[model samples]
Target: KPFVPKLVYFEPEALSYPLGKELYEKFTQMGIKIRETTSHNQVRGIPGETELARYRNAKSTLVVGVRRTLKFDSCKPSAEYAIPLATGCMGHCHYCYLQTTLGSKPYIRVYVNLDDIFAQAQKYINERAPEITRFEAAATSDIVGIDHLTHSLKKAIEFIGATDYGRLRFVTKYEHVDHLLDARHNGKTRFRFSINSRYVINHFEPGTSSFDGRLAAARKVAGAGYKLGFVVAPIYRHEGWERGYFELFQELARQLEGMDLSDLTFELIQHRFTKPAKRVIEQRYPKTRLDLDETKRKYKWGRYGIGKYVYRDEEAKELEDTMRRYIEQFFPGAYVQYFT
Candidate 1:
């Protein structure tokens, strides 16, 4: 099914591409507001809580343009390179780091030039022929969430599957993934779901799929023979936090019962926010309670060239130990890739 958008704005150059033409026709038939503009920035909505809420309510309003600069950025630990397919997202999580990085233009922008992006990736792979090269596709946005519209995720999966030594990795919070289940991935893609406690999902992760929906989608992916993984991110220390995470683990164990988890991976990330991120989030969501207290967090500089507020040593250690114990106890066969 095509993901319907409330407002569909396109750049003049976007229609020149095939996928852009397809999207325009699809959204047009859906009876939505489809307009052509010089740039995606022209359609950027007003910046206020009410307007932000309205814009987010209108799902997947974005620009279809070509990515002129087809450069692959270095992504250290997850993959060797960050492959750009689509930029921006449809979700409006209160603690999303994009609120700061993307600033005012938080609307989704999908590039129709997958062939160019994949060709650049092929060059990277050929450069490192003897060694397997990995690319992180969802470093900026949840491609799976919007994949129904762009078909970039499926194309990337098939492209990587045909390669000899290139792998694709991405994480998503959405579960509209039936389209990707039958892909010929050949184990070249590592699909991960970004998850959190139920309370966190209900409050912080607005405009995203429910946790149960993601779990069901994960089950389908696993059954379809894709390498599966999970990311329990932005771990909060709210009331009954341990119990909440334990329940999450129990649900995972229940759903993944008999599934091949020998290669299953888990990544745990505690909640952290930068000063500018906190400011932007506050400006966009005035009544949000995302816990930006500097006193409760320690200042840490990231390799991305910015300082952010992270959990203190004691809290981090506790979170790490607790997650380790839970994962080991619940999922004895699954591998804990990283926890921090």
Candidate 2:
């Protein structure tokens, strides 16, 4: 259970990630003030003040995760940059990486010093002009879940709109997106919805919003003039799956009819998890049905390998054919992007 968090805080003194220090230097070399705060208590609660300090001291508290920075995955997608405001997720999806990485800490932690992040981001944008077309909101966590509490999404909306950044994207399965629509980004920040088949969602992702609910939120945001995308990710294959997927696809089409499809981007990927991560996830969620399926993997560690997919070549092709045919019928001219 997530601590009934009174105030989400960050310890500036307990700083990690040496890459950020190098990023600070890079930004400085570009004449950007890569402000650094050595104060251990730099990150504090929002509206949390003490007699010792009236306003929180954060030279640059916002943590930045540059694209193509990590050694594991150096190749970044074209026109996409990843920025992080939080480290972990609150949604306890069974297959989520956090289950493996973070054993049971469900508290949604937000970096308190967003102003510093904003400043550095602005400076970086000014210096690294014409290259950063897309800045994704922290690939680490769901951009919408704790956003209501921390107001990070609001800041992102404000920051992205105020700047010259071409487009920003935030992915979520949140249903109550009217608050975002009410703000009316007017096609500035892109609102992408993470979706899967109804059966997959109901059986695998218990806490997440439903497919219809996601579509409802997507329609609302799209109507409010935000670019929209539907990501049918972690697609699962199992017995009696065709009927399940057919119904899901039909409902997705029905739900999406409420919104404009001119700017929709669809992404689909089969679910695969590393063995170690799978073990950790299974242990974390005792009740979750996330045990490894021997048949899903071609070999012992095939799931961890790049070519490992839940469905074999023939199964994957069938799913693609069925899904693509439906997409062509319902929404023409929509671009489909895929990632393994």
Candidate 3:
């Protein structure tokens, strides 16, 4: 597996399932330190003194378990529901909200009960018929890194591919798509890549695929007959940001030269931070250059009264305007879904 974990924990009951048994035998053969946990929900024995130390250890930890809860959470705006195949991530991106969301239980997990999970998804699709139901696979984690071991993404893609009223979509910051290139997705999966300027990736998004590597993977993805999409995320205002984003679009144009871009979509998201998340981010990455300053951002209240610091009117205007202009100029056929 490309995503080799330093430590692995499995539930005793997890071995009862076929996939779980396969994983235990496979990792055990490889000599990756494997242990048993009472429950995957409450993983213990991750030794570390400080927050950062524990976070780092947790990132390298992998939990193989069953998804006890099958009631999927609703993911508004992006998709109808979140299909949980995994949780947490191995990547060490400094500004990601997972720093706060998975604060205590920071280890990554891969669910073993694919068929059971799919049965629940089918019911969700049946409940909303005539209307197509979209399932987002990466809302909780970037699974591509560990898909080789789990093969869950490929299975999910094929599962949704067979459904007439269901669609699967996920965004990845990794380039591990060789096995997925030939998946029988039936044109129902929108494989998206999370792209950003070189400056952003080099500074804040560590342990992520390089800009050129992701673009090359995108080209291969478009060639595989799957609908391609790009998520230009956490668009913060850094020095030379205008030029940075300009070159980003320029490189994308050169990379995606002759692809069918009619259904291609671009989602733009500016950098924003919540108060609780800021502290976690600061502690995890003490020297990160991410601009989470409230004074420089526009504080907007969200649902449940939780708020985040976003770019102000004029600042947001420049970021969106610049991004939209570049997208239109290069790929006129592409659709810009939203900018937020």
Candidate 4:
């Protein structure tokens, strides 16, 4: 009963690693034999033999590598650069935008030329040190959780950390915070965790860390002196939504007890998506518990089809006020960031 291990297709001359092997061995030890698709796909017609050969050549399809040009692009002071280092994630989160943005299945694409991207990113930040600001490692994948396998995200952190221009943020919910700590991640490299209700995480995000695990990891990362933030985002409006989230906040309060408030930031954002992305998401993940209907609220879209699920002006204030008041009452002086 080997766990059907996730598959990764590597390109020719790409570097391989032991992390995926470790994962395969771990699953095998538990009686799960994860399969590698690289070699398996060669029997069929997979484009790019040179690239696919690396993966096919892997002893155990634990990991396959590909060479990608990682570039450090300038980010607006307000906007963060979205890096898609890996194509997908292992965690089977039903509401994940990746389900639509990426393919339905959970496979990872590793970029080997991350070191080059790191150097380039530093060059960009150093050139415009004064104007550049904070950066986010991933919008497409969890940066830290799988960072141990790829280490590119951490490399992104180190690249940014070395620069005085701004900070880099890596967010995740896996209990692998220790790896970032081991990378000697500094205060400039902010670590954010996507915190949600235990129910959602357990049922939707099957393979991810628990709410308490996230909280504990955050507390430890913060304690170890890395800047810490929490994104209680994509807040699904389920029955007793407030209770589920509030209990999470309470647990956060308890777990993060006695930590300094200076580096802590909390973000509360509602769920919204492009009509097309939403449709694709729903179709791709029919089992998802996400509530994408916006008929109840007056919604509109901005230039790039954003703001479709906005709470309007007045309703926006109400959502913000509710989250603000709760955060204030609970954390009392902690910085709470919210968007509709």
Candidate 5:
């Protein structure tokens, strides 16, 4: 099921745009708690006594506003640019990077002025003419989870479809793709779903779609002609870890038996946390069983000089080898994009 927030914060300026107006009307009609905020950036009056309570309350909140900043950021390895359609997510995943990134403001926010955003994207595509410029749509939020109310991702898919040198991709942990299935995507959008072993999903990824549900939605998108991709993320070395992940691929192999997976890709991401992230995640999910122990992890420097704890070399190699073997055994034509 798609996300339904407990409260909604709206920007008056957002009502100037059609999407913003529509959302305001719909939420008001639904009798959802609504308050006027001067800007989506500075929302107030979220009733909560403690920090954890506030964080959880914020996760159940939605903010509708306009995206003023049009300059897209560079999304290396994944895409050329990070498309801004929304910010924050409804999922209560303990290891979510947004725990640290969206530390102060955890409420989900959707932009209204999509035309301006798309216009800016068109300029970027024009600048990189003759070369496809890829854009990552879910850079800060799981857009599909919020798309049921906004429909921004479907609009993005069609927009990119109209361009010759543009491609759009986004990953989601939600199974809300029925509305996007019939989009005139023209195969320009790479629809990806973040998958994890049952152990990981059950323990860590709360408020997200189940593994079987994501696979079912992936089948729907693949049938609709959108390129399919799966991200086996936060691969944890939990008890029965090998068996858990092995069965993950075995089920995928069975589920996607005869589909056209020529353009399919798999991105493997191991579980890791930084000092700040560990603190934030711990505070938010005090009872989480996630292993953020620095002693067992290897610190790797990031592009911005800050480092993150990742699996050690030996363990990382074993994880990659097992994943590669499973992919080769199941879908030989699929591509293993990267392991990070």
Candidate 6:
């Protein structure tokens, strides 16, 4: 109920697609304000008087359009490719990586070209025949939050469920997943939730579900028999960090008391940001309390030859060690895919 969008911008060409037409009608029937645009990118409002205001408003705003890019980007370690159904989000997370990539205009954007996207995915699956091809659908956007309007996840889930060698994976920080619960997914998709400590949720992840709410939603998905995963991401090293993560693990165990953990997995990502990202974040959130200081962090060159501010080797080891201990103690045999 909390994921409603107050203002929706629809690209004129989007209405030509069935999903787009249905979404326009649904939101209109729900009495939400609608603005039609020649291009989704054409509809614009003053993001903010200050840069931070602009970033925050961008997260709150929503846009619907058709995705013209047919070539998917590679997704390493996690999946084989990025199967984009959307391109933005409704959460005003101050530490979101999207802040760097989406630039000043950070409005949530949903693409209505599902059939074409799926068709391309099928070709990729056939190309990698005899070996499974994996797709990361929520790499850029939180589809669960806006799925009620588009139902793209349902279509993707059912589509991949029927495939012989295609697998789908997506992560979300929202709680609107009841609609996908009854789909015949055939265990082809890995549904993960991007979670963090209660402190991170209260301080950095504004306009999103609470930690407990996310856990409850995860339990619901697990109960529905989908393979469950958690991305305990962007873990910060603030005061009481160790205790907070410990409590978080305990709470996870408490929530999934009777649930099976055989297929459960996790990906732990400690906080890291590039210099350009820091500059953009600073300009966008001048009064933000994020810890983007370079002096205390170690500089590591990314795959693209860009340097990012990350934890020192010792600090990274310490954080991963603590997390591994807590995970082992609570989750027993559950697998941790990686701690980056």
Query: How do all the candidates rank in terms of TM-score, highest first?
Result: 5, 3, 6, 1, 4, 2
After superposition on all C-alphas, the RMSD of every candidate to the true structure, in Å, is: 2.3, 10.3, 1.3, 6.3, 1.1, 1.8
Worst 10 residues of 2 by lDDT: 51-60
- Candidate 4 lDDT over 1-340, as tens digits, reads 0113333344443425343444444545766434444432232233235532422233122334433445544333313454435545666566666654554223455555555555655665666668756666666666566667556776676666667775677678777766667565556776788887766676677667877778788777777788878887766556776677678777777887777866577787665565666666565556776666767555675764345564456756655676676677777777875454
**Model 1 Cα lDDT, one tens digit per residue, 13-105:** 888889988988888887877777677655654223675574454345677777888888887678999998877887879988776666656
lDDT of 6 by residue, 145-243 (tens): 878767899999999999999999999888888898998899998999988787888889877888777888898889898999999998899879999
Residue pairs in clash, model 4: 2-32, 2-33, 3-32, 5-34, 11-51, 12-51
lDDT of 4: 0.60
Q: How many clashes show up per model? A: 0, 2, 0, 6, 0, 2
> If both were scored by TM-score, which would come out higher, candidate 4 or candidate 6?
6
Alpha-carbon TM-score of each model against the true structure: 0.93, 0.72, 0.97, 0.77, 0.97, 0.94
Which of 5 and 6 is the better model by lDDT? 5
Model 6 lDDT, residue 119, Cα: 93
Cand. 2 TM to true fold: 0.72
Q: Measured by C-alpha RMSD in angstroms, how accurate is candidate 6?
A: 1.8
Considering TM-score, which of the candidate structures 2 and 5 is the better prediction for this target?
5
Q: Order candidates by lDDT, high to low.
A: 5, 3, 6, 1, 4, 2
Candidate 3 at residue 68, lDDT?
93
> Candidate 5 — which pairs collide?
none
- What TM value does model 5 have? 0.97
Count backbone overlaps in model 6.
2
Residues 66-117 of candidate 2 have per-residue lDDT tens digits of 2222211211452355555665554557777554443333334455445555
Instruction: State each model's CA lDDT, in order.
Output: 0.83, 0.58, 0.89, 0.60, 0.91, 0.85
Error of 3 at 297 (Å): 1.1
lDDT per residue for candidate 5 within 1-340, as digits (tens), equals 6788889998999989999889988998999999899999999988899988998899899999889999999986789999999999989898898876778989999999999999999999999999999999998999988898889999999999999999999999988889999999998999999988888999999899898889899999999999999999888899998999999999988999788888999999888877889878878899999888999999998887468999999999999999999999888988999987
